[PDB]
Amino acid sequence: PARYSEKGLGFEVRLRDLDAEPGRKEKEEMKRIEDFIVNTGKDKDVDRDSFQTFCK
DNA sequence: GATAAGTGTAGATAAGTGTAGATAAGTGTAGATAAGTGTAGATAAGTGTAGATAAGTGTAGATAAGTGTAGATAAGTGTAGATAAGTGTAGATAAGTGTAGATAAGTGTAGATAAGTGTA
């Protein structure tokens, strides 16, 4: 995720419209979806592929 | 004390100015062509007039912007326990200062050579 990467390089989950401002729950849902992608799943599990392994 | 900078003094040539004559600048004068203006006719700018199409506005119906209303999840806050920040307290070493003796900075003092100035 770019969110945690100070150089901004990575991926992000975003609202579609550039003009919208995200609601209080939407900002958290977007962070959850990012985390889900990183973990490739709901829970953390070292036995599962990371997103890096998936992409490779 | 010895020489030559610095000034007054005497003569020889050519700058500097007045004077006299020869040519052509500078101005008035007379004639010949074509600038400059008034005058007459021919074409097409400039304006009013009449008809033909489509800008411009009001009117009527169909879909979906815009708002109120009802339910489901998870932001947001108070409450209870577990570890380690944060402070006081006791002992061990070495910063920090006063104190004692050895060497050489720091100053006064005596004599020799040469800038330092007057003089010929």
Coordinates of C-alpha atoms (C1' of nucleotides) in Angstrom, one line a residue:
Chain A
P1 CA 0.0 0.0 0.0
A2 CA 1.0 3.6 -0.9
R3 CA -0.9 4.7 2.3
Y4 CA 1.9 3.4 4.5
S5 CA 4.8 4.0 2.0
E6 CA 6.2 7.4 2.6
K7 CA 7.4 7.7 -1.0
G8 CA 3.8 7.2 -2.1
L9 CA 4.7 4.2 -4.3
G10 CA 2.3 1.3 -4.2
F11 CA -1.4 0.7 -4.5
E12 CA -4.4 2.4 -3.0
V13 CA -8.1 1.7 -2.6
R14 CA -10.0 4.9 -3.5
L15 CA -13.4 6.3 -4.2
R16 CA -14.3 6.3 -7.9
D17 CA -15.2 10.0 -8.2
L18 CA -12.3 12.3 -7.6
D19 CA -14.8 15.0 -6.5
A20 CA -16.2 13.0 -3.6
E21 CA -15.0 13.3 0.0
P22 CA -15.1 9.9 1.8
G23 CA -17.5 9.5 4.8
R24 CA -16.4 8.4 8.2
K25 CA -17.3 4.7 7.5
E26 CA -16.0 4.8 3.9
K27 CA -12.5 5.7 5.0
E28 CA -12.4 2.7 7.3
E29 CA -13.9 0.4 4.7
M30 CA -11.2 1.5 2.2
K31 CA -8.5 0.8 4.8
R32 CA -10.1 -2.6 5.4
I33 CA -10.2 -3.5 1.7
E34 CA -6.5 -2.5 1.4
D35 CA -5.6 -4.7 4.4
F36 CA -7.7 -7.5 2.9
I37 CA -5.8 -7.3 -0.4
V38 CA -2.4 -7.1 1.4
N39 CA -3.3 -10.2 3.4
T40 CA -5.0 -11.7 0.4
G41 CA -7.8 -12.6 2.8
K42 CA -9.7 -11.6 5.9
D43 CA -7.3 -12.9 8.6
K44 CA -3.6 -12.8 8.7
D45 CA -2.0 -16.2 7.9
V46 CA 1.7 -16.7 7.2
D47 CA 0.7 -19.9 5.2
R48 CA -1.2 -17.9 2.6
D49 CA 0.4 -16.0 -0.2
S50 CA 1.0 -12.3 0.2
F51 CA -0.2 -10.0 -2.6
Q52 CA 3.4 -10.0 -3.8
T53 CA 3.5 -13.8 -4.2
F54 CA 0.1 -13.6 -5.9
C55 CA 1.2 -11.0 -8.4
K56 CA 4.5 -12.8 -9.2
Chain B
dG1 C1' 84.2 71.3 -1.9
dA2 C1' 83.1 70.3 -7.2
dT3 C1' 80.0 70.1 -11.0
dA4 C1' 76.1 71.6 -13.7
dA5 C1' 70.8 72.8 -13.0
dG6 C1' 68.6 77.6 -13.7
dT7 C1' 68.2 82.4 -15.5
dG8 C1' 69.5 86.8 -18.1
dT9 C1' 71.3 88.2 -22.6
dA10 C1' 72.4 88.7 -27.9
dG11 C1' 71.5 87.5 -32.7
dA12 C1' 69.1 84.8 -37.0
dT13 C1' 65.2 82.9 -39.3
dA14 C1' 60.4 82.6 -40.4
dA15 C1' 55.5 82.9 -38.0
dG16 C1' 51.8 86.6 -38.4
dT17 C1' 49.4 90.6 -40.6
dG18 C1' 48.2 94.3 -44.1
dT19 C1' 47.9 95.1 -49.1
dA20 C1' 46.8 94.3 -54.3
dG21 C1' 44.9 91.7 -58.3
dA22 C1' 42.1 87.6 -60.8
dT23 C1' 38.4 84.3 -61.0
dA24 C1' 33.8 82.7 -60.1
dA25 C1' 30.3 82.3 -56.0
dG26 C1' 25.7 84.9 -55.4
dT27 C1' 21.5 87.5 -57.0
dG28 C1' 18.2 89.8 -60.3
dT29 C1' 16.0 89.1 -64.7
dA30 C1' 13.5 87.0 -69.0
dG31 C1' 11.2 83.1 -71.4
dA32 C1' 9.1 77.9 -71.9
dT33 C1' 6.8 73.9 -70.2
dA34 C1' 3.5 71.5 -67.3
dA35 C1' 1.9 71.5 -62.1
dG36 C1' -2.8 72.9 -60.1
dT37 C1' -7.8 74.0 -60.3
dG38 C1' -12.6 74.6 -62.4
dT39 C1' -15.9 72.2 -65.3
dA40 C1' -18.9 68.6 -67.9
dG41 C1' -20.6 63.8 -68.5
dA42 C1' -20.9 58.3 -67.5
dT43 C1' -21.1 54.5 -64.3
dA44 C1' -22.3 52.2 -60.1
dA45 C1' -22.0 53.1 -54.8
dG46 C1' -25.9 54.0 -51.3
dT47 C1' -30.8 53.8 -49.7
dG48 C1' -35.9 52.7 -49.6
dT49 C1' -39.2 49.0 -50.7
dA50 C1' -41.5 44.2 -51.2
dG51 C1' -41.7 39.2 -50.6
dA52 C1' -40.0 34.2 -48.6
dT53 C1' -38.0 31.2 -45.1
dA54 C1' -36.8 30.0 -40.5
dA55 C1' -35.0 32.2 -35.9
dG56 C1' -37.5 32.9 -31.4
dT57 C1' -41.3 32.2 -27.8
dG58 C1' -45.4 29.9 -25.6
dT59 C1' -47.7 25.4 -24.8
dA60 C1' -48.4 20.2 -23.6
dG61 C1' -46.7 15.6 -22.1
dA62 C1' -43.0 11.8 -20.3
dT63 C1' -39.1 10.4 -17.6
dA64 C1' -36.1 10.7 -13.6
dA65 C1' -33.6 14.4 -10.6
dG66 C1' -34.6 15.6 -5.5
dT67 C1' -36.4 14.9 -0.7
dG68 C1' -38.7 12.4 3.3
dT69 C1' -38.9 7.9 5.6
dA70 C1' -37.6 3.1 7.6
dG71 C1' -34.2 -0.5 9.0
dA72 C1' -29.1 -2.7 9.7
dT73 C1' -24.2 -2.3 10.8
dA74 C1' -20.4 -0.4 13.2
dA75 C1' -18.2 4.4 14.5
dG76 C1' -17.8 6.6 19.2
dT77 C1' -17.6 6.6 24.4
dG78 C1' -17.4 4.8 29.3
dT79 C1' -15.5 1.2 32.2
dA80 C1' -12.1 -2.5 34.2
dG81 C1' -7.5 -4.7 34.5
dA82 C1' -2.0 -5.4 33.5
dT83 C1' 2.6 -3.8 32.6
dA84 C1' 6.2 -0.4 32.9
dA85 C1' 7.0 4.9 32.5
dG86 C1' 8.4 8.3 36.2
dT87 C1' 10.3 9.8 40.8
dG88 C1' 12.7 9.2 45.4
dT89 C1' 16.6 7.0 47.7
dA90 C1' 21.5 4.8 48.9
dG91 C1' 26.3 3.9 47.7
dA92 C1' 31.0 4.3 44.6
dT93 C1' 34.2 6.7 41.7
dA94 C1' 36.5 10.7 40.1
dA95 C1' 35.4 15.8 38.6
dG96 C1' 36.8 20.3 41.0
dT97 C1' 39.7 23.2 44.1
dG98 C1' 43.5 24.6 47.4
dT99 C1' 48.4 23.9 48.3
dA100 C1' 53.8 23.2 47.6
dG101 C1' 58.2 23.4 44.8
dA102 C1' 61.1 23.8 40.1
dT103 C1' 62.0 26.1 35.8
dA104 C1' 62.3 30.0 32.8
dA105 C1' 59.3 34.2 31.2
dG106 C1' 60.0 39.3 32.2
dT107 C1' 62.6 43.6 33.4
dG108 C1' 66.8 46.4 34.7
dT109 C1' 71.6 47.2 33.6
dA110 C1' 76.5 47.7 31.0
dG111 C1' 79.3 48.1 26.6
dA112 C1' 80.1 48.0 21.2
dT113 C1' 78.9 49.3 16.6
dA114 C1' 76.8 52.1 13.4
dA115 C1' 72.1 55.6 11.6
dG116 C1' 71.9 60.3 12.3
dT117 C1' 73.0 65.2 11.6
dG118 C1' 76.2 69.2 10.8
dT119 C1' 80.0 70.8 7.8
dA120 C1' 83.4 71.6 3.8

